[PDB]
PDB file of C-alpha atoms in Angstrom:
ATOM      1  CA  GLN A 295     161.874 -69.780-147.117  1.00  0.00           C
ATOM      2  CA  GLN A 296     164.208 -72.181-148.753  1.00  0.00           C
ATOM      3  CA  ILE A 297     167.801 -72.227-147.584  1.00  0.00           C
ATOM      4  CA  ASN A 298     170.514 -72.402-150.385  1.00  0.00           C
ATOM      5  CA  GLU A 299     174.275 -73.482-149.978  1.00  0.00           C
ATOM      6  CA  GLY A 300     176.545 -70.454-150.211  1.00  0.00           C
ATOM      7  CA  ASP A 301     173.842 -68.411-148.600  1.00  0.00           C
ATOM      8  CA  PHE A 302     174.428 -66.752-145.126  1.00  0.00           C
ATOM      9  CA  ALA A 303     172.323 -68.648-142.455  1.00  0.00           C
ATOM     10  CA  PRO A 304     169.198 -66.874-141.093  1.00  0.00           C
ATOM     11  CA  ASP A 305     169.171 -66.239-137.386  1.00  0.00           C
ATOM     12  CA  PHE A 306     166.680 -67.880-135.119  1.00  0.00           C
ATOM     13  CA  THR A 307     165.372 -67.918-131.679  1.00  0.00           C
ATOM     14  CA  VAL A 308     165.111 -71.114-129.722  1.00  0.00           C
ATOM     15  CA  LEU A 309     165.022 -72.426-126.038  1.00  0.00           C
ATOM     16  CA  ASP A 310     167.892 -74.235-124.188  1.00  0.00           C
ATOM     17  CA  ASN A 311     167.080 -76.796-121.555  1.00  0.00           C
ATOM     18  CA  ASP A 312     167.134 -74.147-119.007  1.00  0.00           C
ATOM     19  CA  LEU A 313     164.356 -71.988-120.878  1.00  0.00           C
ATOM     20  CA  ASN A 314     166.977 -69.397-121.932  1.00  0.00           C
ATOM     21  CA  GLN A 315     166.698 -67.838-125.436  1.00  0.00           C
ATOM     22  CA  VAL A 316     169.390 -68.882-127.679  1.00  0.00           C
ATOM     23  CA  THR A 317     170.031 -67.349-131.277  1.00  0.00           C
ATOM     24  CA  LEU A 318     172.808 -68.050-133.825  1.00  0.00           C
ATOM     25  CA  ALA A 319     174.962 -65.518-132.249  1.00  0.00           C
ATOM     26  CA  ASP A 320     175.267 -67.415-129.056  1.00  0.00           C
ATOM     27  CA  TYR A 321     177.723 -69.627-131.077  1.00  0.00           C
ATOM     28  CA  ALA A 322     179.634 -66.685-132.696  1.00  0.00           C
ATOM     29  CA  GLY A 323     183.026 -67.714-134.284  1.00  0.00           C
ATOM     30  CA  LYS A 324     182.199 -71.406-134.346  1.00  0.00           C
ATOM     31  CA  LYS A 325     181.363 -73.788-137.314  1.00  0.00           C
ATOM     32  CA  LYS A 326     178.020 -75.595-136.653  1.00  0.00           C
ATOM     33  CA  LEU A 327     176.590 -78.864-137.572  1.00  0.00           C
ATOM     34  CA  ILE A 328     172.810 -78.289-137.122  1.00  0.00           C
ATOM     35  CA  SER A 329     170.962 -81.638-136.844  1.00  0.00           C
ATOM     36  CA  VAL A 330     167.119 -81.292-137.012  1.00  0.00           C
ATOM     37  CA  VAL A 331     164.613 -84.054-135.943  1.00  0.00           C
ATOM     38  CA  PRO A 332     160.887 -84.567-135.621  1.00  0.00           C
ATOM     39  CA  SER A 333     161.464 -85.902-132.160  1.00  0.00           C
ATOM     40  CA  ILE A 334     164.345 -87.031-129.922  1.00  0.00           C
ATOM     41  CA  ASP A 335     161.990 -89.337-128.342  1.00  0.00           C
ATOM     42  CA  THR A 336     161.876 -91.447-131.517  1.00  0.00           C
ATOM     43  CA  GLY A 337     164.537 -94.178-132.151  1.00  0.00           C
ATOM     44  CA  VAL A 338     166.034 -93.004-135.455  1.00  0.00           C
ATOM     45  CA  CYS A 339     166.186 -89.437-134.343  1.00  0.00           C
ATOM     46  CA  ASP A 340     168.015 -90.690-131.096  1.00  0.00           C
ATOM     47  CA  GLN A 341     170.503 -92.587-133.121  1.00  0.00           C
ATOM     48  CA  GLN A 342     171.073 -89.436-135.358  1.00  0.00           C
ATOM     49  CA  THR A 343     171.679 -87.347-132.348  1.00  0.00           C
ATOM     50  CA  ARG A 344     174.169 -89.652-130.816  1.00  0.00           C
ATOM     51  CA  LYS A 345     176.109 -90.126-133.899  1.00  0.00           C
ATOM     52  CA  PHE A 346     176.636 -86.664-134.947  1.00  0.00           C
ATOM     53  CA  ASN A 347     177.570 -85.876-131.359  1.00  0.00           C
ATOM     54  CA  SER A 348     180.177 -88.696-131.215  1.00  0.00           C
ATOM     55  CA  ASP A 349     181.647 -88.385-134.567  1.00  0.00           C
ATOM     56  CA  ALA A 350     181.968 -84.535-134.834  1.00  0.00           C
ATOM     57  CA  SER A 351     185.057 -82.808-133.267  1.00  0.00           C
ATOM     58  CA  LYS A 352     183.623 -80.647-130.610  1.00  0.00           C
ATOM     59  CA  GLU A 353     187.098 -79.138-129.933  1.00  0.00           C
ATOM     60  CA  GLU A 354     186.824 -77.663-133.395  1.00  0.00           C
ATOM     61  CA  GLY A 355     183.135 -76.459-133.651  1.00  0.00           C
ATOM     62  CA  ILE A 356     179.519 -77.048-132.371  1.00  0.00           C
ATOM     63  CA  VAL A 357     176.819 -79.737-132.989  1.00  0.00           C
ATOM     64  CA  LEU A 358     173.293 -78.280-132.391  1.00  0.00           C
ATOM     65  CA  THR A 359     170.145 -80.534-132.220  1.00  0.00           C
ATOM     66  CA  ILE A 360     166.915 -78.689-132.976  1.00  0.00           C
ATOM     67  CA  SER A 361     163.487 -80.159-132.609  1.00  0.00           C
ATOM     68  CA  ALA A 362     159.784 -79.219-131.575  1.00  0.00           C
ATOM     69  CA  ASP A 363     160.162 -81.380-128.636  1.00  0.00           C
ATOM     70  CA  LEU A 364     159.493 -79.212-125.340  1.00  0.00           C
ATOM     71  CA  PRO A 365     162.669 -78.149-123.560  1.00  0.00           C
ATOM     72  CA  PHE A 366     161.664 -80.453-120.625  1.00  0.00           C
ATOM     73  CA  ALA A 367     161.719 -83.570-123.151  1.00  0.00           C
ATOM     74  CA  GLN A 368     165.100 -82.604-124.341  1.00  0.00           C
ATOM     75  CA  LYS A 369     166.441 -82.064-120.791  1.00  0.00           C
ATOM     76  CA  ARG A 370     165.109 -85.462-119.857  1.00  0.00           C
ATOM     77  CA  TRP A 371     166.647 -87.174-122.891  1.00  0.00           C
ATOM     78  CA  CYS A 372     170.101 -85.920-122.222  1.00  0.00           C
ATOM     79  CA  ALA A 373     169.915 -87.152-118.642  1.00  0.00           C
ATOM     80  CA  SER A 374     168.493 -90.447-119.766  1.00  0.00           C
ATOM     81  CA  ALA A 375     171.293 -90.845-122.333  1.00  0.00           C
ATOM     82  CA  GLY A 376     173.939 -90.043-119.527  1.00  0.00           C
ATOM     83  CA  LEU A 377     175.356 -87.292-121.781  1.00  0.00           C
ATOM     84  CA  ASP A 378     176.166 -83.869-120.485  1.00  0.00           C
ATOM     85  CA  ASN A 379     178.008 -82.656-123.661  1.00  0.00           C
ATOM     86  CA  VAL A 380     175.086 -82.611-125.972  1.00  0.00           C
ATOM     87  CA  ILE A 381     173.387 -79.351-127.070  1.00  0.00           C
ATOM     88  CA  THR A 382     169.663 -79.676-127.581  1.00  0.00           C
ATOM     89  CA  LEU A 383     167.467 -76.589-128.399  1.00  0.00           C
ATOM     90  CA  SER A 384     163.702 -76.441-128.630  1.00  0.00           C
ATOM     91  CA  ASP A 385     161.734 -74.700-131.515  1.00  0.00           C
ATOM     92  CA  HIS A 386     158.247 -75.416-130.020  1.00  0.00           C
ATOM     93  CA  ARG A 387     157.269 -72.048-129.028  1.00  0.00           C
ATOM     94  CA  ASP A 388     157.339 -70.139-132.475  1.00  0.00           C
ATOM     95  CA  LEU A 389     158.862 -72.655-135.028  1.00  0.00           C
ATOM     96  CA  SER A 390     161.329 -69.588-135.574  1.00  0.00           C
ATOM     97  CA  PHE A 391     164.086 -72.031-136.637  1.00  0.00           C
ATOM     98  CA  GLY A 392     161.857 -74.349-138.509  1.00  0.00           C
ATOM     99  CA  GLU A 393     160.203 -71.518-140.682  1.00  0.00           C
ATOM    100  CA  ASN A 394     163.500 -69.689-141.257  1.00  0.00           C
ATOM    101  CA  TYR A 395     165.180 -72.973-142.376  1.00  0.00           C
ATOM    102  CA  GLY A 396     161.946 -74.426-144.472  1.00  0.00           C
ATOM    103  CA  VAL A 397     161.770 -77.602-142.420  1.00  0.00           C
ATOM    104  CA  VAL A 398     158.382 -77.469-140.980  1.00  0.00           C
ATOM    105  CA  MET A 399     156.148 -80.418-141.466  1.00  0.00           C
ATOM    106  CA  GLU A 400     152.890 -78.155-141.251  1.00  0.00           C
ATOM    107  CA  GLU A 401     150.379 -81.022-140.867  1.00  0.00           C
ATOM    108  CA  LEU A 402     152.245 -82.367-137.957  1.00  0.00           C
ATOM    109  CA  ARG A 403     153.714 -79.196-136.359  1.00  0.00           C
ATOM    110  CA  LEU A 404     157.000 -81.069-136.382  1.00  0.00           C
ATOM    111  CA  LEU A 405     160.300 -80.336-137.870  1.00  0.00           C
ATOM    112  CA  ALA A 406     161.629 -82.477-140.831  1.00  0.00           C
ATOM    113  CA  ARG A 407     164.592 -84.669-140.512  1.00  0.00           C
ATOM    114  CA  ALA A 408     167.473 -82.518-141.919  1.00  0.00           C
ATOM    115  CA  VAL A 409     171.095 -81.340-141.689  1.00  0.00           C
ATOM    116  CA  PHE A 410     172.748 -78.072-142.250  1.00  0.00           C
ATOM    117  CA  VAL A 411     176.472 -77.222-141.919  1.00  0.00           C
ATOM    118  CA  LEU A 412     177.594 -73.717-141.225  1.00  0.00           C
ATOM    119  CA  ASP A 413     181.156 -72.452-141.429  1.00  0.00           C
ATOM    120  CA  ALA A 414     182.407 -69.908-138.870  1.00  0.00           C
ATOM    121  CA  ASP A 415     180.827 -67.034-140.874  1.00  0.00           C
ATOM    122  CA  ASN A 416     177.351 -68.731-140.876  1.00  0.00           C
ATOM    123  CA  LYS A 417     177.882 -69.610-144.519  1.00  0.00           C
ATOM    124  CA  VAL A 418     175.832 -72.554-145.353  1.00  0.00           C
ATOM    125  CA  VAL A 419     178.432 -75.158-146.729  1.00  0.00           C
ATOM    126  CA  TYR A 420     175.964 -78.217-146.660  1.00  0.00           C
ATOM    127  CA  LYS A 421     172.322 -79.001-146.638  1.00  0.00           C
ATOM    128  CA  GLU A 422     170.247 -82.286-146.689  1.00  0.00           C
ATOM    129  CA  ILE A 423     166.541 -82.437-146.190  1.00  0.00           C
ATOM    130  CA  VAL A 424     166.151 -86.334-145.549  1.00  0.00           C
ATOM    131  CA  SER A 425     164.001 -87.717-148.321  1.00  0.00           C
ATOM    132  CA  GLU A 426     160.895 -89.960-148.162  1.00  0.00           C
ATOM    133  CA  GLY A 427     161.820 -93.606-147.631  1.00  0.00           C
ATOM    134  CA  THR A 428     165.586 -92.848-146.592  1.00  0.00           C
ATOM    135  CA  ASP A 429     166.952 -94.749-143.658  1.00  0.00           C
ATOM    136  CA  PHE A 430     169.067 -92.006-142.103  1.00  0.00           C
ATOM    137  CA  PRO A 431     170.873 -88.568-143.174  1.00  0.00           C
ATOM    138  CA  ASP A 432     174.101 -88.799-144.896  1.00  0.00           C
ATOM    139  CA  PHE A 433     176.298 -88.741-141.820  1.00  0.00           C
ATOM    140  CA  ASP A 434     179.599 -89.018-143.663  1.00  0.00           C
ATOM    141  CA  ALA A 435     178.716 -86.174-146.211  1.00  0.00           C
ATOM    142  CA  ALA A 436     177.751 -83.801-143.299  1.00  0.00           C
ATOM    143  CA  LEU A 437     180.713 -84.677-141.238  1.00  0.00           C
ATOM    144  CA  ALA A 438     183.103 -84.257-144.089  1.00  0.00           C
ATOM    145  CA  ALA A 439     181.684 -80.799-144.754  1.00  0.00           C
ATOM    146  CA  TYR A 440     182.056 -79.972-141.128  1.00  0.00           C
ATOM    147  CA  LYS A 441     185.564 -81.411-140.777  1.00  0.00           C
ATOM    148  CA  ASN A 442     186.696 -79.624-144.094  1.00  0.00           C
ATOM    149  CA  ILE A 443     185.994 -76.125-142.556  1.00  0.00           C
TER     150      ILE A 443
ATOM    151  CA  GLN B 306     138.288 -67.633-122.674  1.00  0.00           C
ATOM    152  CA  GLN B 307     136.642 -68.536-119.789  1.00  0.00           C
ATOM    153  CA  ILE B 308     134.900 -71.807-118.651  1.00  0.00           C
ATOM    154  CA  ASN B 309     133.046 -71.565-115.307  1.00  0.00           C
ATOM    155  CA  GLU B 310     131.444 -74.086-112.987  1.00  0.00           C
ATOM    156  CA  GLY B 311     127.995 -74.822-114.365  1.00  0.00           C
ATOM    157  CA  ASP B 312     128.830 -74.271-118.094  1.00  0.00           C
ATOM    158  CA  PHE B 313     129.009 -77.119-120.468  1.00  0.00           C
ATOM    159  CA  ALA B 314     132.397 -78.598-121.451  1.00  0.00           C
ATOM    160  CA  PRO B 315     133.784 -77.503-124.940  1.00  0.00           C
ATOM    161  CA  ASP B 316     134.715 -80.070-127.515  1.00  0.00           C
ATOM    162  CA  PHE B 317     138.438 -80.518-128.258  1.00  0.00           C
ATOM    163  CA  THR B 318     140.786 -82.428-130.772  1.00  0.00           C
ATOM    164  CA  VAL B 319     143.940 -83.853-129.209  1.00  0.00           C
ATOM    165  CA  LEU B 320     146.333 -86.718-130.042  1.00  0.00           C
ATOM    166  CA  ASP B 321     146.813 -89.954-128.181  1.00  0.00           C
ATOM    167  CA  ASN B 322     150.227 -91.546-127.652  1.00  0.00           C
ATOM    168  CA  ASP B 323     149.979 -93.113-131.045  1.00  0.00           C
ATOM    169  CA  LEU B 324     148.922 -89.943-132.898  1.00  0.00           C
ATOM    170  CA  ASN B 325     145.484 -90.908-133.199  1.00  0.00           C
ATOM    171  CA  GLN B 326     142.937 -87.874-132.956  1.00  0.00           C
ATOM    172  CA  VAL B 327     140.786 -87.928-129.779  1.00  0.00           C
ATOM    173  CA  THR B 328     137.753 -85.698-129.155  1.00  0.00           C
ATOM    174  CA  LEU B 329     135.286 -85.092-126.228  1.00  0.00           C
ATOM    175  CA  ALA B 330     132.919 -87.689-127.708  1.00  0.00           C
ATOM    176  CA  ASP B 331     135.487 -90.634-127.298  1.00  0.00           C
ATOM    177  CA  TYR B 332     134.686 -90.448-123.583  1.00  0.00           C
ATOM    178  CA  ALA B 333     130.874 -90.141-123.779  1.00  0.00           C
ATOM    179  CA  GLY B 334     128.800 -91.422-121.193  1.00  0.00           C
ATOM    180  CA  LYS B 335     131.353 -91.252-118.449  1.00  0.00           C
ATOM    181  CA  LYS B 336     132.283 -88.620-115.720  1.00  0.00           C
ATOM    182  CA  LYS B 337     135.801 -86.977-116.231  1.00  0.00           C
ATOM    183  CA  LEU B 338     138.497 -85.609-114.136  1.00  0.00           C
ATOM    184  CA  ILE B 339     140.742 -83.449-116.518  1.00  0.00           C
ATOM    185  CA  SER B 340     144.103 -82.669-115.149  1.00  0.00           C
ATOM    186  CA  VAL B 341     146.036 -80.066-117.220  1.00  0.00           C
ATOM    187  CA  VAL B 342     149.799 -79.673-116.971  1.00  0.00           C
ATOM    188  CA  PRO B 343     152.743 -77.483-118.453  1.00  0.00           C
ATOM    189  CA  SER B 344     154.708 -80.631-119.005  1.00  0.00           C
ATOM    190  CA  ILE B 345     154.672 -84.244-117.634  1.00  0.00           C
ATOM    191  CA  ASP B 346     158.577 -84.103-117.830  1.00  0.00           C
ATOM    192  CA  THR B 347     158.716 -81.831-114.796  1.00  0.00           C
ATOM    193  CA  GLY B 348     158.539 -83.099-111.248  1.00  0.00           C
ATOM    194  CA  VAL B 349     155.393 -81.222-109.910  1.00  0.00           C
ATOM    195  CA  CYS B 350     153.489 -82.359-112.961  1.00  0.00           C
ATOM    196  CA  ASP B 351     154.628 -85.915-112.732  1.00  0.00           C
ATOM    197  CA  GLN B 352     153.408 -85.880-109.163  1.00  0.00           C
ATOM    198  CA  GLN B 353     150.094 -84.282-110.052  1.00  0.00           C
ATOM    199  CA  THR B 354     149.439 -86.813-112.912  1.00  0.00           C
ATOM    200  CA  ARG B 355     150.272 -89.857-110.500  1.00  0.00           C
ATOM    201  CA  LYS B 356     148.133 -88.410-107.613  1.00  0.00           C
ATOM    202  CA  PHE B 357     144.903 -87.863-109.666  1.00  0.00           C
ATOM    203  CA  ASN B 358     145.396 -91.326-111.255  1.00  0.00           C
ATOM    204  CA  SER B 359     145.889 -93.102-108.122  1.00  0.00           C
ATOM    205  CA  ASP B 360     143.331 -91.324-105.824  1.00  0.00           C
ATOM    206  CA  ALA B 361     140.319 -91.195-108.369  1.00  0.00           C
ATOM    207  CA  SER B 362     138.214 -94.351-108.821  1.00  0.00           C
ATOM    208  CA  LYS B 363     138.557 -95.472-112.497  1.00  0.00           C
ATOM    209  CA  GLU B 364     135.753 -97.948-111.892  1.00  0.00           C
ATOM    210  CA  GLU B 365     133.952 -94.495-111.479  1.00  0.00           C
ATOM    211  CA  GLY B 366     134.880 -92.359-114.308  1.00  0.00           C
ATOM    212  CA  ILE B 367     137.837 -91.350-116.762  1.00  0.00           C
ATOM    213  CA  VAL B 368     141.045 -89.557-115.502  1.00  0.00           C
ATOM    214  CA  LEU B 369     142.505 -87.447-118.493  1.00  0.00           C
ATOM    215  CA  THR B 370     146.045 -85.705-118.435  1.00  0.00           C
ATOM    216  CA  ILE B 371     146.399 -83.061-121.108  1.00  0.00           C
ATOM    217  CA  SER B 372     149.540 -81.041-122.019  1.00  0.00           C
ATOM    218  CA  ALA B 373     151.511 -79.498-124.813  1.00  0.00           C
ATOM    219  CA  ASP B 374     154.141 -82.188-124.516  1.00  0.00           C
ATOM    220  CA  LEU B 375     154.639 -84.086-127.852  1.00  0.00           C
ATOM    221  CA  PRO B 376     152.865 -87.340-128.102  1.00  0.00           C
ATOM    222  CA  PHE B 377     156.298 -88.990-128.066  1.00  0.00           C
ATOM    223  CA  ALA B 378     157.223 -87.626-124.784  1.00  0.00           C
ATOM    224  CA  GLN B 379     153.963 -88.745-123.140  1.00  0.00           C
ATOM    225  CA  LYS B 380     154.230 -92.180-124.650  1.00  0.00           C
ATOM    226  CA  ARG B 381     157.774 -92.458-123.314  1.00  0.00           C
ATOM    227  CA  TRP B 382     156.652 -91.244-119.773  1.00  0.00           C
ATOM    228  CA  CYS B 383     153.971 -94.086-119.606  1.00  0.00           C
ATOM    229  CA  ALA B 384     156.347 -96.579-120.824  1.00  0.00           C
ATOM    230  CA  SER B 385     159.183 -95.638-118.498  1.00  0.00           C
ATOM    231  CA  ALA B 386     156.707 -95.186-115.506  1.00  0.00           C
ATOM    232  CA  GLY B 387     155.245 -98.737-116.173  1.00  0.00           C
ATOM    233  CA  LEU B 388     151.794 -97.098-116.220  1.00  0.00           C
ATOM    234  CA  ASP B 389     149.571 -98.832-118.649  1.00  0.00           C
ATOM    235  CA  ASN B 390     146.249 -97.390-117.118  1.00  0.00           C
ATOM    236  CA  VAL B 391     147.160 -93.616-117.409  1.00  0.00           C
ATOM    237  CA  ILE B 392     145.490 -91.615-120.393  1.00  0.00           C
ATOM    238  CA  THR B 393     147.792 -88.908-121.710  1.00  0.00           C
ATOM    239  CA  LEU B 394     146.806 -86.771-124.481  1.00  0.00           C
ATOM    240  CA  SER B 395     148.825 -84.061-126.431  1.00  0.00           C
ATOM    241  CA  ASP B 396     147.397 -80.665-127.258  1.00  0.00           C
ATOM    242  CA  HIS B 397     150.705 -79.671-129.126  1.00  0.00           C
ATOM    243  CA  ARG B 398     149.468 -79.362-132.537  1.00  0.00           C
ATOM    244  CA  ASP B 399     146.738 -76.771-132.527  1.00  0.00           C
ATOM    245  CA  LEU B 400     146.038 -75.930-128.677  1.00  0.00           C
ATOM    246  CA  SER B 401     142.516 -76.995-129.463  1.00  0.00           C
ATOM    247  CA  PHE B 402     141.849 -78.057-125.951  1.00  0.00           C
ATOM    248  CA  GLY B 403     143.901 -75.089-124.095  1.00  0.00           C
ATOM    249  CA  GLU B 404     142.037 -72.317-126.314  1.00  0.00           C
ATOM    250  CA  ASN B 405     138.572 -74.037-125.744  1.00  0.00           C
ATOM    251  CA  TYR B 406     139.202 -74.376-121.956  1.00  0.00           C
ATOM    252  CA  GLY B 407     141.003 -70.887-121.496  1.00  0.00           C
ATOM    253  CA  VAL B 408     144.133 -72.361-120.001  1.00  0.00           C
ATOM    254  CA  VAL B 409     146.954 -71.457-122.527  1.00  0.00           C
ATOM    255  CA  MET B 410     149.935 -69.682-121.166  1.00  0.00           C
ATOM    256  CA  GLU B 411     150.264 -67.637-124.330  1.00  0.00           C
ATOM    257  CA  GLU B 412     153.736 -66.183-123.804  1.00  0.00           C
ATOM    258  CA  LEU B 413     155.093 -69.808-123.275  1.00  0.00           C
ATOM    259  CA  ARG B 414     152.875 -71.850-125.536  1.00  0.00           C
ATOM    260  CA  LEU B 415     152.140 -74.132-122.690  1.00  0.00           C
ATOM    261  CA  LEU B 416     149.102 -75.170-120.797  1.00  0.00           C
ATOM    262  CA  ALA B 417     148.546 -73.885-117.225  1.00  0.00           C
ATOM    263  CA  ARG B 418     148.256 -76.144-114.469  1.00  0.00           C
ATOM    264  CA  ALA B 419     144.429 -76.623-114.046  1.00  0.00           C
ATOM    265  CA  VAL B 420     141.654 -79.205-113.205  1.00  0.00           C
ATOM    266  CA  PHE B 421     138.097 -79.587-114.616  1.00  0.00           C
ATOM    267  CA  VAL B 422     135.570 -82.097-113.426  1.00  0.00           C
ATOM    268  CA  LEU B 423     132.931 -83.001-115.692  1.00  0.00           C
ATOM    269  CA  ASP B 424     129.646 -84.976-114.950  1.00  0.00           C
ATOM    270  CA  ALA B 425     128.579 -87.662-117.410  1.00  0.00           C
ATOM    271  CA  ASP B 426     126.515 -84.996-119.346  1.00  0.00           C
ATOM    272  CA  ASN B 427     129.624 -82.836-119.566  1.00  0.00           C
ATOM    273  CA  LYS B 428     128.541 -80.043-117.161  1.00  0.00           C
ATOM    274  CA  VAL B 429     131.551 -78.521-115.588  1.00  0.00           C
ATOM    275  CA  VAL B 430     130.851 -79.110-111.720  1.00  0.00           C
ATOM    276  CA  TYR B 431     134.352 -78.084-110.569  1.00  0.00           C
ATOM    277  CA  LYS B 432     137.171 -75.802-111.906  1.00  0.00           C
ATOM    278  CA  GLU B 433     140.547 -74.789-110.777  1.00  0.00           C
ATOM    279  CA  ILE B 434     143.145 -72.961-112.655  1.00  0.00           C
ATOM    280  CA  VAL B 435     146.183 -72.999-110.153  1.00  0.00           C
ATOM    281  CA  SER B 436     147.351 -69.633-109.190  1.00  0.00           C
ATOM    282  CA  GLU B 437     150.991 -68.469-110.121  1.00  0.00           C
ATOM    283  CA  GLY B 438     153.447 -69.284-107.389  1.00  0.00           C
ATOM    284  CA  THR B 439     151.019 -71.836-105.342  1.00  0.00           C
ATOM    285  CA  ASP B 440     152.674 -75.269-104.886  1.00  0.00           C
ATOM    286  CA  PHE B 441     150.000 -77.514-106.229  1.00  0.00           C
ATOM    287  CA  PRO B 442     146.234 -77.872-107.100  1.00  0.00           C
ATOM    288  CA  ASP B 443     143.704 -78.564-104.520  1.00  0.00           C
ATOM    289  CA  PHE B 444     143.695 -82.322-105.011  1.00  0.00           C
ATOM    290  CA  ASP B 445     141.187 -83.033-102.200  1.00  0.00           C
ATOM    291  CA  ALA B 446     138.498 -80.619-103.472  1.00  0.00           C
ATOM    292  CA  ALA B 447     138.706 -81.820-107.093  1.00  0.00           C
ATOM    293  CA  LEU B 448     138.685 -85.552-105.920  1.00  0.00           C
ATOM    294  CA  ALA B 449     135.732 -84.932-103.744  1.00  0.00           C
ATOM    295  CA  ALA B 450     133.778 -83.034-106.593  1.00  0.00           C
ATOM    296  CA  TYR B 451     134.566 -86.127-108.822  1.00  0.00           C
ATOM    297  CA  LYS B 452     133.631 -88.766-106.067  1.00  0.00           C
ATOM    298  CA  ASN B 453     130.243 -86.933-105.448  1.00  0.00           C
ATOM    299  CA  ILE B 454     128.997 -87.374-109.061  1.00  0.00           C
TER     300      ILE B 454
END
């Protein structure tokens, strides 16, 4: 459907890099910054992933990266980047996350670039679906929503 | 559903590493070794890809690697491998190839490890769908079938 700020976040089922099922409850009690990309194997999406992960206080909450990349791509990316502190989750099987959050590019079977921030109660306190022609998501706005919780 | 030796090769629509559509007709007039993999970003599948590519004469026919990997992962694999003579194709979008050739692992939305050898008029002259828990395909038998055409 469409996610509106103020609404409770819908649950989803995605896969970790070890092929385990992950749902929103696996991060119970934490704030979340959910960064959605078309592919981690593209340059702009790489840069988005790295910047949210470096800039967001991970002592205070969780940064999720969600894409239609296979789990095997996402695991290889983390190894290649030399980062073991970066959570990547794969919506490839079902587009559970993408359908529930309204970010599927249907003609591509890829997820649209987007950002959600959820408070510790899964209240949606920020949303950006990145527009046509826009260089990057608004890092600062999302990061401020996250830090304010 | 099930392609058997002596049947004709179905059509398919897949993507090349630059997101161009590719179909059976784009390889008209040539014999084909089609190597199917769950993901090029796994070790066993990396080795399968490299072995068929190295051991099959490409003065002889075409060696195709098909998986559900995104095009971006396949592009990155070729680039990082320094392999500019390996054809990788992505069935991610629609599973056109995997459904037509009967090789989807439907509970995972990945392609089963499998090998089809096609003569120049697209008769299937050799097939293996690799059994669950067997180490590798029979490289020698498929390569023999290919070389014999």
